[PDB]
Design a binder for this molecule. Structure first.
Ligand SMILES: COCC(=O)Nc1ccccc1
Ligand SMILES: COCC(=O)Nc1ccccc1
Lengths: 348, 348, 348, 348, 348
């Protein structure tokens, strides 16, 4: 017995839709959902989606409040829809997927993932919910996350971090590292050997290794000496060249974080969404060095060192494909006389 | 257990809110309420009010679908709120009154008219509903309509016509003439001797008397002779003078209707609302004669003849107050040498 | 001392902005201007313009309520702005010109037409207003309309009809035929010999000549015989061919009107604006004959007969330029063996 | 002589409505109020209210710019309307009260608080304004704030802090501690003995006592030892248990502030308004411990210690009512074997 | 071949409009521009302008991404339009100028600055673009910026800082100091000797001189002693008097920055735009001292000391005009007994 006023009552009394009975008075003005609290209207939700306000409100209220995979992982694994939940995209303030299965009467394409309409879609299944591993086994397409082993099914250990209510974190009081499974046309697919992005913020960047601790602490010349990175263009790629009108390199988040402590810079996120490789219009505030499209990836510095040191340096131009977050990321490797000139997450 | 989807279900299945159980999927985009009917969205309501869309939708759904007094009568009698109903103002596409009593959780000031907040307001009571005549008895301020005699109370016979779903009509299969009662600070009032406006349309004008039948049939010179209206400026007041750049007179609807059969004209209703006297920006298309503010009243021609023939014609300028629709309408009477020059419902 | 509430007061009490002092309470929700009349909000104006609501409200209130040239004439004569008035475009529900001169603080480019900013613009001047004929004299570029003779200047007799509050009419109680004058870079121009469109409606079409009276009364074969129009393709051009999937001809409004009395049809006005030649997506309901772009002009049938009979019929395809409403309208004349096949106002 | 352009002129030239004469050009597009400053439009106000844009703009301009009681105190004391001022709710970006008395023509229910419509409403009176203490004496219902003593009337010393233009502060150059008075049905009401919340921010939290200074400085085990709080569940209630998937306790703002310095956490304020007890959807960023509804109160730690130490610890479950900010706040006290298990501001 | 989808493609792939060929799917809902990225809609632009969404989107995409003069300098120099570029006003999130020259089909008044419509407008020319110095020479009105000398034309050395993508900076990898030229009615105008504002933020304030370094480091009494500023009211003007209900002085940004480190304060920017003198509604959080209109200028403290020390101190009240950012800023100088009482950027 779903209603706007019942969804609103749940938001007001439980913090989210908890299936409790009751109604509060609601008013909808434009794209904002308000409720009457002691004579005056209080804003409950601002529609930042392309869906009708009341519809978005319901999906936001019915959002999954358990640690879930980050939208980039779900996209990289080809997920189209979720089974009886709403994965909320906090980077976009909108549902991660267009339609729902057993969530909202307006967005539902089916009540159960077993309906023939879900067969061609990659449905996301959560093994922590009862009967969802069995629904994955019966699905034609899908992705499954589990906390433990599923007999017979070969696991793929996912990232240490997961998104809990928009807060990406490595769980201590909750499990955030999941086993991942994928199915394409009824056939379980072997998920590749992958690297994971660290999902760190530029503002609250924290090193997750001795190499990362030495990068932020030591000077450029002593770090490149200690970790024997001579001839790998770390000065351009990781550190960034701010001497010309076009900002050179700066494609690793740890390098952006090191610079950020010395001087600020504008990072214009012109495509705001969760992505393995993020593109930014960077403008350095100190020098005035800028780049319209600066591809930035957040790999662990040890993983990025391993990737670049595992390359053949004898070709002038070469595309280097690296599996990161289950997706193949093409990099552009430019060499000269057996040394790296540039290495960057390939644009276009 | 009121909800947006339950109100919508009632509209879809019963034509209005009939208190039936059930929900249909709803989407609200801007000021329009839509429902999903077989995969596609169908518009159910367009908010033309100053209230939130969903709130106005509920009040529109909960509108009184029985013949009710016209909003002008209700306003003229000082009605502030209705008892457990919504009088819908079809001339304004909005509720006739700001707040409700036992209708909508958002607009309700009380659930029952007996709550102390309704004591100072003039609450409209419908005697056709059970216990409302007794609620009028207990109420300090209010207006009561009844179909029949009310023991003790002295009636005021209201107009022959009432508004049934926006259609103003003189009932044949329903009762539309009501007995009116009014109470101010606990005292039953003696409602004044009043004339009633006929609430006719310019397009579908129909004569309600032999004088009105003779006005539309005979020529100006013959009618003024037959009804001995010489010296009463009927040529200017009722018939209208279209010989100069400012349209002369034309203040009675029957005169506008006689004109309309021959020549069409633009009537710009710049204050769209139900009023005893209506103001129009008229532009005659045949001649180009025009008036920015042309006050138009729809009295029965016999009643207008009686009003004008009961005036002293010895003063150049005089305000003539006439009780019409329980309100005092001031008219401006201009004379010269014992004859009328003009007589019109006083503007501003 | 211009204000939103003062403009609103003028609309409520005078029908338009009449420079009277006073304020009424106003509320603006979206694109609608409302006022509080006895506790409830009444809609005063709906913004159908690309200007801010309150700005368009003021310009609409300050609209010229005297018979003015039709927007098509003003456009055809290169008018950019009006002198201390607002020509309201009722076909577009928006001001005919972007900026104003001494009307609204938001849209004003100058307070007086003598300011250097108005020198390059073609300013419209109304000779009926005091000093405007002298303002035309001092103005470098402009169009002047007068009711009578202007000493020195040679007149151009304009159309019989003018627009009074959106009602296009040939005045009887007002002057609608104006003398036209034009100045380009300080030089008074000799306005060309022109035909005028009649500005008639399809619904209320009235014949303005014996030929037009005979067109609507007689049958196709009798009319073409009486007026010796054999070989001029009047059957296709004026009468219209409804025998194939593409509606043949039908470019003269009198022919559309003759049809309209017998069979109705859809005229989709896909470019809603005042134009000498109007384009329509016509769908005949009786036959199903249709044309995506059907150019329709409303010339007097005697004038259209004169135009077509004054053409050389020896070329297969030829562009025929005809001055109508002071603008050059290109027509497409198609002949075969010394007779007209088609003649139509050239599209795109 | 109130107008949109006059309100706008005052905002532009005085920072707020200061009753100065003059008009600036205004444009209203959607919910934003703009003014023309040197050819371009500058945004003056963004309507975040449920009122019409121009109406909200006027109330925002006419906001009380003197230190006023915080909206929570005004709500807790039953205030419905203010006398000839607008208390602006900065937590909601909207007027604290629906209607006004002598402020805006659109929202006014009366010009003076002595009108019979204000009799049943609790009107807020400011003793610092001339004649307002006399208006409180004559009012039927109301709340009065004064800077000094009012002869005969028994005072209630309010909080040290007040809101000056949205900045909650304890005045140094202004008086912020007021004497409070209340009237219900003509009878002055004795305001209860109350505790006051400190109105501190989580970001800029500053200790206001030696106990608070010792809480933020000392470790959990030495603070609980120094202040003899053994057996009072301060570890769970104040400090917070972040070891399980549901965040334990954490109901005092000082405890949230202590945690905040070690690691961040998301506090989702799902009901954004000024309240004595605030509810939050807290997600700990370090551990991943979370609570959908975490009631948080900001009492001085000495006051919270006094409240919990004044309780009978012999019952398993008990409701403990504590007067805070003139309102009765129910707490839930859970004990076992003569010791506290939990104590929290009771939800539902 | 300009289009909405082509502009969107450029934003998505290049970070801004780079004239590249291609289209992405776009959806416009209200004032937001979205694109479909892998099945879901991602927001690309939020219209904060008074222009149509798609129009503003194009101008934002076509914004000048090279260091440009700050909007205040451009306004102070009378700039009306830019030549074949869009100066984006980041303080207003809107184009700095209403119309364009060769940028957008909707906003263009001309394709080239040589069209007669641009003659009366002060067109901004960028000497770094080919042929723009020649277009300035041929223009009637305009402002020209150049990186080097233009033969014959006498330069005006502009500010050290320029705005690169909204980041105001003193270039290191780019040139930000430009030579300035102005033309009024075909005649080059001598730009006056001027001071420049420093364009610093209150949050990230950095001293640009030994005097500024000593102001922020030394106490009020030792700074005024070291720089011999006794009798110049620096305690009131620069330092600010927070002892009374009206905040005294505080008109220099360095003084606001010194205070900001000790305690916070609300600066309500009620006219959000780039201005030489900025007006703020300041509320001191510590004391509760406030000022509705507090004019704040950001001069180098050495320049402000030079201005105040170059004044005659023998008059009670005097207007002191100082050329800053090419505009004349009137200050109000109040003296008594040969000493300054106050000196502030004159309001009204
Ligand atoms: C004290 O007010 C009088 C009244 O309401 N009398 C009445 C009302 C309803 C029916 C009969 C009598
Ligand atoms: C230099 O322009 C000629 C002109 O305007 N002549 C005129 C204008 C108005 C009335 C009589 C003569």
């Amino acid at each position: 017995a779903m209603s706007l006023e019942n969804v609103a009552f749940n938001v007001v009394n439980k913090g989210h839709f908890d299936g409790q009975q009751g109604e509060v008075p609601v008013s909808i003005i434009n794209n904002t959902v308000y409720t009457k609290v002691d004579g005056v209207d209080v804003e409950l939700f601002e529609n930042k989606t392309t869906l009708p306000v009341n519809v978005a409100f319901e999906l936001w209220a019915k959002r999954n409040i358990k640690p879930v995979p980050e939208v980039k992982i779900l996209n990289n694994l080809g997920v189209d829809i979720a089974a009886n939940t709403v994965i909320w995209d906090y980077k976009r303030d909108a549902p991660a997927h267009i339609s729902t299965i057993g969530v909202c009467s307006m967005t539902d394409i089916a009540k159960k993932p077993t309906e023939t309409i879900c067969a061609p879609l990659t449905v996301f299944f959560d093994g922590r919910v009862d009967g969802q591993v069995d629904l994955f086994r019966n699905a034609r397409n899908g992705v499954l996350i589990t906390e433990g082993s599923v007999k017979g099914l070969q696991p793929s250990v996912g990232p240490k971090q997961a998104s809990l209510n928009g807060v990406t974190l490595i769980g201590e009081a909750v499990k955030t590292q999941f086993n991942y499974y994928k199915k394409v046309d009824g056939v379980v697919q072997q998920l590749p050997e992958t690297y994971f992005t660290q999902s760190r913020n530029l503002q609250e960047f924290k090193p997750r290794s001795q190499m990362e601790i030495d990068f932020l602490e030591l000077a450029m010349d002593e770090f490149i000496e200690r970790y024997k990175l001579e001839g790998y263009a770390f000065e351009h790629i990781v550190y960034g060249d701010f001497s010309h009108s076009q900002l050179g390199g700066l494609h690793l988040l740890i390098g952006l974080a090191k610079r950020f402590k010395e001087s600020p810079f504008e990072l214009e996120d012109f495509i705001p969404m969760d992505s393995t490789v993020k593109n930014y219009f960077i403008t350095d505030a100190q020098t005035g060095s800028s780049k319209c499209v600066c591809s930035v990836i957040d790999l662990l510095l040890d993983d990025f060192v391993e990737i670049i040191k595992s390359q053949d340096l004898s070709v002038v131009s070469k595309v280097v494909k690296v599996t990161i977050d289950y997706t193949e990321i093409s990099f552009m490797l430019w060499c000269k006389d057996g040394h790296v000139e540039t290495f960057y997450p390939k644009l276009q």
